[PDB]
Design a protein around this ligand. Sequence first.
Ligand SMILES: CCCCc1nc2[nH]nc(N)c2c2c1CSC(C)(C)C2
Ligand SMILES: CCCCc1nc2[nH]nc(N)c2c2c1CSC(C)(C)C2
Lengths: 546, 546
Amino acid sequence: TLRAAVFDLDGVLALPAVFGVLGRTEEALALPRGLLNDAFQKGGPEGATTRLMKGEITLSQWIPLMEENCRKCSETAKVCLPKNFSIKEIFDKAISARKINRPMLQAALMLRKKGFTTAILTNTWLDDRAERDGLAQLMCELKMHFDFLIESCQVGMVKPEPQIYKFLLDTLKASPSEVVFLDDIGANLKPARDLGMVTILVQDTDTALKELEKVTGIQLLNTPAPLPTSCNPSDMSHGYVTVKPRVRLHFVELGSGPAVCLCHGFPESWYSWRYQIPALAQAGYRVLAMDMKGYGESSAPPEIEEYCMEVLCKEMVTFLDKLGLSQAVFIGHDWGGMLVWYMALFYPERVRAVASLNTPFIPANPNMSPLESIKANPVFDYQLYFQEPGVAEAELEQNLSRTFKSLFRASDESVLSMHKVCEAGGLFVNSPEEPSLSRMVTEEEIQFYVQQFKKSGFRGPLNWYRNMERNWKWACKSLGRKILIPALMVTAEKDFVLVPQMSQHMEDWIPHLKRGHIEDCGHWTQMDKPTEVNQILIKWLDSDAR
Amino acid sequence: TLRAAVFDLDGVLALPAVFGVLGRTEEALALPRGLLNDAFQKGGPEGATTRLMKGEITLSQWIPLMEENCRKCSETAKVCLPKNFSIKEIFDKAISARKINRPMLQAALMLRKKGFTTAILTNTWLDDRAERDGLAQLMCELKMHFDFLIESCQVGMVKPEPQIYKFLLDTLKASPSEVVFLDDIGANLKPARDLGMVTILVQDTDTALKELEKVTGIQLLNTPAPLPTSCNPSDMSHGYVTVKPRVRLHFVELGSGPAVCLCHGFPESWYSWRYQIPALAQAGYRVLAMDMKGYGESSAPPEIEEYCMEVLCKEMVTFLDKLGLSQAVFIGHDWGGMLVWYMALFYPERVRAVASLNTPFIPANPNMSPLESIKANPVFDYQLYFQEPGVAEAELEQNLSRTFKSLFRASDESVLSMHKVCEAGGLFVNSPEEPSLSRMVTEEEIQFYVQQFKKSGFRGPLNWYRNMERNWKWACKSLGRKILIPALMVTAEKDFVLVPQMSQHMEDWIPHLKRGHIEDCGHWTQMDKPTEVNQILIKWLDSDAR
Ligand SMILES: CCCCc1nc2[nH]nc(N)c2c2c1CSC(C)(C)C2
Ligand SMILES: CCCCc1nc2[nH]nc(N)c2c2c1CSC(C)(C)C2
C-alpha cells in the first residue's frame, strides 16, 4: 500500500526537458547525431557532468569543460562545430524554456491532499549563471508543494548510484514498497525498481498519469479544476508596525516586486485573502495582507472615533512611512474597499493603483444626513442595528463558530434575512443554532476566524460602521476631486447589499475606470470565486500597476 | 526663548524652487515677463491655484485650468504661446529637478538634536500625476526628520491666510514667540511676523543659516560632518518567520527594491546595522536586517549542532522560501560574513550578490584539523576560550553593561589584551569593572544590547564558535568550487584579528572579486566608520547588485 510519490524534475515536473536540447541542437545545426549528447556524458562517473551533478563544481566552471568535450567529440566524428556555438547560450535558453508541467504538479498536489508524502528527487547543478534567478524562481514555485526536495548537487550523490535511493527512502521514513517513483530516464528508474519501489517510465504525461492513478487508485486525470494555493498561517512571514503609541498593525507578507496592500472587510482577517496571497506573489508582487485596525493581531482600541475613515487612512499612510514605502497598490473588499477609495482621494501620491471588490465609489450627498441615506435603502438596515454599542457585539460574540458559519456562505446557501433586522432583533434570529458548513470554507478555516476574534471581539470591527457622520463630513471635502489614478471596480452579481448597479455612475468621478464582473458570486468574493478574482487582479496589476 | 523651527518646502528645504520655473520658462521661450507667473496666480483666493492648494481639486484637474489662464494672459499681453507648450511637461520637469537642500535639512536635524520641535509647513497639492512617485519619495525622505508635516491641501487652509498660522501654533503647542519660521516668500512670512513669530526671509541658504544660528544661538554652519540616520527600534517594521518547529527568525524591514539581507556578527544584533538600514533603503533597496539565530527576538536553541554553518545556511534558505524571495543580496560582518560566503558557495541561485565586512574567504585545509589551524594564530586564542560550554557564558553574562562597553570600542580605545586569553582566565580579566563609554556608542545604544541579551544570553551566540570540526568537514565539500557571482570584500585596517592581509589570496577562489578598504577602522566596522561603509556598499550595490 503506497504512501509516497517521488518525481524527477527534468522531463517529469518540468517541460521541455533540458536533456532533449542537445538532440534539438544537433538537428538544428545539422551535426552528427548524439554528438553533443555524448560530449555531455563524457567520462561517465568521473567526467565533468558527474562532478557538476554531485556539487563538486558549479555550472560556470562546467561550461568550459563541456565545450572541451564538444571539441574532442567533433574530432572523432570528423565534423566541425559552427562559428559561434555557445554551450552557455544553448543552456540559458533551454533552462529558460523549461516550465512547470502543470498536470504533473496537479497530480502531486492531489496525492498530497489524499495523505501522500511527496518529494522531488533530481540530478541538478549549483547554478551561478548571471541568469540563475529564473530557475531559482521555478524551484521556489515547485518545492512549496512537496514534503521534500532532494537535489543531487546538495547531497553529493547522483542517480543512478544506489546510495541516493537509500538516502531517499531514509528521508521518506518508508519501505521501497510504499513508494511510487516517476522518471523519464529508464537507467535512473532501474535502481528504484531493483529495490521493489513502484516505478513509472514517463514519456508523455497523460500515459504516466493513467499509470499513476491505476497504481494509487486515486483519480488524477480529468479531475475538476482545483482551487488556487491557500495559506497556512504558521508558514507566513508576520509583520508588525507601531503607527502610534497605542496602535500596532499586523500584516502577512509574501513575494517581491511592487507593494500590493490587501484591505479586508467586515468582519474579516488578513486570512480572507488566503487564495490571493500566493497567486499575487507568484505573479511578481510583494503582498502585504493586513489585519485591519480592530482585527486579529492588530490593535483594537475601544473608542468609536479611532475607526473613522480619516484616522484609518492616516494610520495606513504612517504604515507606508514606517515600512519605507513611497507607494503601494491598495486592494480593498467591503469596508476595506471603502478605505481604498478614500486613500485614492486623499493620498494619490501614496497609491500606485486602487482596486475595490463589491464596494462602489459613491460621492457623499451634502444635502442629506448619511443616516437618512442609509434609511433610504432597505438592504442597509443591518447598518442601523450596528449603531447602538454592545447590541451587535452581544449577538456576534455569543457563539463565534455560529457567527462565521452563518455569515460565510455562498449566494445559494442563504441563512440570513437582511430585511427588517433591528425589528427582527438581530442578524441570526431566524438562523439555526447549528448552521451547516458552507462549501466555501473548511471547519479548520472557520476555527481560525473563531481563534482570531477571541482576542478583541466585535467592538473595534463594529466601530467601522459607527462613524457615518464623521466620514460624511470628511468625504464632503473631496467633492470637487476626481480619481485619475489607475482604478479597478469589481462587481459580484449576487451581492444583495453591494449590488452591481450601485457602481453604475462611477465613471462620472473615475473616467479611466476599469471593470471586472464576477457571475454567481456573493458578498464573500475572495473565497467564493478565488480563481476569477486572481485572474481579474493579476491581469489588471500587469496592465495598470507596473 | 525659541523651542520650535518651522520650514517651508519649496525654496527652503527643497531646491530649485518649483515657483521659479515659470520665470525660467518665460526667459527660455522669450515670452513677456511674469506672463506665466501671473496666469499661475490668476483669480487670487478664488482662482484655480488656491483651490488646488486647499485640496479642493487635484493637480491633474488643475493642469487644464492653468493652460486656460495661460491663454487669457497671452491675449491681454498680445503674445503667442509656442506650438507644443505643455504645463504638464513644465511641471513634471520642475518637480523632478527639485532636490533636498541638504544644508537646510542638516540645520533642521541639528536643531531637533538640540531639543527643538521641528515642522514643515507647506502650500502643496494632491498629486495624481502618472509620475507622482518621485515627489512621494522626496516627501518620505524629508518628513521622517521632523515632528510635523503640515500640508495646505490636507488641512484645507493656505498661506498667507492666518488660520493656518493659528493651526500651526496649536499643533506645535507653543506661543508665536518660541517659534522661528523660514520662508522664501515675504508675503507668506508676514502673518507669522504679525503674530510675533521670529521669521527669516530665505533667499540664499547660507545667509538664512547665519540668521538662524544668530537667533537660536546654535552653531549650524561649518558644522563637522554628521553621522548617517540611525534607527529607533520602536519605529521599525518587525518581521517573524518560523523556519522550523522550534526556530523563528526575527528581522527589521525597511524600503522597497531588491532584497538585501544583513547578517551581523558576534555578539551583535540587527541593531549593529542601524546606520546602514535607512541609507540602503534610501538608495532603492528592501532591507532585511536579521537577528541571527541565538540572538535578540530570534529563537536561541540550547544545542551546539543547531549553530553549525550547514544548518544556519539551510535555515536562511527556508527564510527566503517562506518570504517568497527567490534571491537576496547577502551582506555579512564577522560570523555573519562567514555565513555569507558559505551561502554563495552552497546556494548561488539564492544569492543575488555576496558582500563581507572584515571576514575573508579562506578555503578549508583538508590536511589540518581546524583546531590545529586556530592554534597556529595567536590572535585566534579567544576562539579556544570559547570552546568549553558555560565558561565564556559566565564571564559574558555576569555584567552585560560591562561586556558591551568593554567590547564595543574603536581601535584607539583598546581595553582588551586578545593575547593568551584562556591563560589570563578570560576576555575582561585586565579590563576595568566600570569601562568608560566609547565614542562609537551612546549609553542608550549600550542598554539596547543589554536588554536584547537578557532574553537568551550568550549560549546560542557562543555556539557559533563551537562547530569548528562540523564546519570544516562541510566546507571541504566545496573545495573544487569557485565563487563566480558578484562579490565584495571590505577590509578594516585596524581589525587586529581579521587583518586585511588575511584576505590577500581571495582572487584565487573569487577572480571577479571587488574590494573596499576602510582606514582607521577597528572590528566594529558598521558603527566605527558608518559613512564610508554606506558609501562602499551603495556604490557596489548600484554597480553589481542591480
Ligand atoms: C444574504 C447574506 C448576504 C451576506 C452579506 N452581504 C453583504 N453585502 N454587503 C455587506 N456589507 C454584507 C454583509 C452580509 C452578512 S451580514 C454582514 C457581514 C454584516 C454584512
Ligand atoms: C582589541 C579589541 C579588538 C576587538 C575584537 N576584534 C575582533 N576582530 N575579529 C574578531 N572576531 C574580534 C573580536 C573582538 C572583541 S572579543 C570578540 C567579540 C569575541 C571578537
